[PDB]
Design a protein around this ligand. Sequence first.
Ligand SMILES: *Cc1c(COP(=O)(O)O)cnc(C)c1O
Ligand SMILES: *Cc1c(COP(=O)(O)O)cnc(C)c1O
Lengths: 387, 388
Amino acid sequence: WSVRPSDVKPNPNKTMISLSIGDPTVFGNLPTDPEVTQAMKDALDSGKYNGYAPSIGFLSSREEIASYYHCPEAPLEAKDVILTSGCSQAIDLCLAVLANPGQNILVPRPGFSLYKTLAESMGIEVKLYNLLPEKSWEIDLKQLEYLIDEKTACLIVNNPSNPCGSVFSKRHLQKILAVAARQCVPILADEIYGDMVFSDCKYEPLATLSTDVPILSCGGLAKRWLVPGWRLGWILIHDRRDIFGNEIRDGLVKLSQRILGPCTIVQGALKSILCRTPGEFYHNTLSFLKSNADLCYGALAAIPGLRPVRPSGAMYLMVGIEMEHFPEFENDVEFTERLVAEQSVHCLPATCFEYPNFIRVVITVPEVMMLEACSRIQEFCEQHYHC
Amino acid sequence: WSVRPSDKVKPNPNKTMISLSIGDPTVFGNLPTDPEVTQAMKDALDSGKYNGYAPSIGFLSSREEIASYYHCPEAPLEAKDVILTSGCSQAIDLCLAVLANPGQNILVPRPGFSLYKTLAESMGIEVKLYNLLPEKSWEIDLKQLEYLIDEKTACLIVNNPSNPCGSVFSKRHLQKILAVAARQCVPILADEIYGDMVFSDCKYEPLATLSTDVPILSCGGLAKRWLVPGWRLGWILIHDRRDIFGNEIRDGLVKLSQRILGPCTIVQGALKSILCRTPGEFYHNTLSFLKSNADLCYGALAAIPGLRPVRPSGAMYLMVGIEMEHFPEFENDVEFTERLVAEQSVHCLPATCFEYPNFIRVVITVPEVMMLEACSRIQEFCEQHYHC
Ligand SMILES: *Cc1c(COP(=O)(O)O)cnc(C)c1O
Ligand SMILES: *Cc1c(COP(=O)(O)O)cnc(C)c1O
């Protein structure tokens, strides 16, 4: 017999407030629209969506996604859509089809930690490119271009960003594409937060700005429809000039037949989710995020020693910590641990996203909980701040 | 730019096609799931409590329910021994991932469900094949089984009841299989998606209720027994013995699960009512339909000269031997099934698909009148091509 695997307590009299949980559902203040719920119930009542779909998804479901995201600058037919078990599987399929062991991918820093996790598990090297906190978390284009070599199979771009809450300008997206053009590298666009911008930027999908650069774009229901548990995502294949060709398409189909795709009830409900979910839902969501973002940025900005970077989208912001003014702490991990011990407020240390001396805060908590949290954080910082 | 990827017959146009080859038992509408299954999902939806992220291995309460439903003292399960998956397919995948590295091997049955080969060989695990015996109700060749396992053999796959064979191993034979792996010290991945779907004079014992010293990862799910394969919910039941798996494998399973992040939370939330409220008569009526159709199909094709079916006790299929010497025109089961489509518009799956030539698989889940028609067409076809 030799069976082996393959290769700080919170302050007890202050009630815990977590600003670290990356799930918009958790406090019940962001339920999905009733129409979303109804579409699932309708799909269930039909009895049509209980049998096996093809691995890449029902044709009609793929057709509905294609026609929901198609535009002349980035056309999509059903054949350009693969439905997946959440965006995470979408990202995983794209990486597994583009990159072999030994090849590298370029990942943002700070960045959603899934990319590094999926890639390093599959033997894929990860090169980290910086985002600039003083330029609205824009990509350091000079470093990005430098980092690309002959082993680079793929470039990961996440816009709008978790953990940054940034929304890249049109110009900056164009400048990102140009780098990818010159170095002849495809892009995996993680656009799970697409259309979730609450600022006076507008959202452009990356593919709608590309002419020469082939893009695999990943999205899903998780965040915009506030049903992350439902496990439905998708890959939008945005080929240019036959660079992906039939081969990447076929490879995606093959790799998809492994797990067999997402829950068929969610695929059946997708038509009515996209067609009947009112504009008010998306608007009320974005209005709540923005005013929570104003309260948070505003409260944290007033605190000596913190440097919040205002978000324009998604469901977070990053806060810089001026460590010189907090001598007793060595990094963001110590800071956040002490904050829990003294104030029972959990913020996520950005060392989790490969970016020390920052923290991420979610802006999806009820506003009265955001208010209380920031207040507690002001007291903590006041009590530990040194000039 | 070097973006490279990583490392037919027309049916008789006069006769309406009858497919006996489709793995989906629901495709014809004669096997809907129970209303309580549907209601449980609707209730889960109305609650608004199952829309957020669950742990990758599944909600504690959902896992508790599965643990509770399959527990018995001879094979105990608590919530920690359960991992909810995106269909039984992923369950089987995760089990093979955690148990075996690129270079190691696994024992797979023949005829065997083809997923075991596709999964293993795609992540670099080499597959070795062990025989099932048609003349002994598709029982495992025990002598060959105990041979062929190297010291590199990471795992033994047992599928019972069987797709494609429709067999249900006896308590005796299951103990005999356990006895092999124990004294040869190799763990069992038990695919029991068809568990409790037995319709003849054999009881269903889950492989682990009979283990004592052989540690088993059992894979099941809602797909077949609750007739909702598309819903993508399965599970792993860890039946460790003597801490042979230990925390390492448990933790290996847990890490790997955090990759995909598990099955739809609505199905997880509905699991309690699905297991608790689905009536006994639903399972019974399903098995009554299956038995009737098995009798009709078995009887029909036995009567046909040149065909030797092996009668099933469970699951949703049976295998039919083709007496190739009485059909000179044909070489393979592939040609036989191709001409059958050409002449009679009946599609049977040639068993070459399952690495077992000169046999065919037939689904016993098509409506009875469709089975009747298909069988009489097959009779005529065989009569028209039979020699001697
Ligand atoms: C949530 C998230 C995902 C994963 O989404 P799921 O559909 O739940 O798998 C991918 N990328 C980013 C940036 C996310 O925040
Ligand atoms: C159908 C089947 C499976 C796959 O089950 P899913 O839950 O649909 O993934 C696994 N094993 C056997 C023997 C099957 O017939």
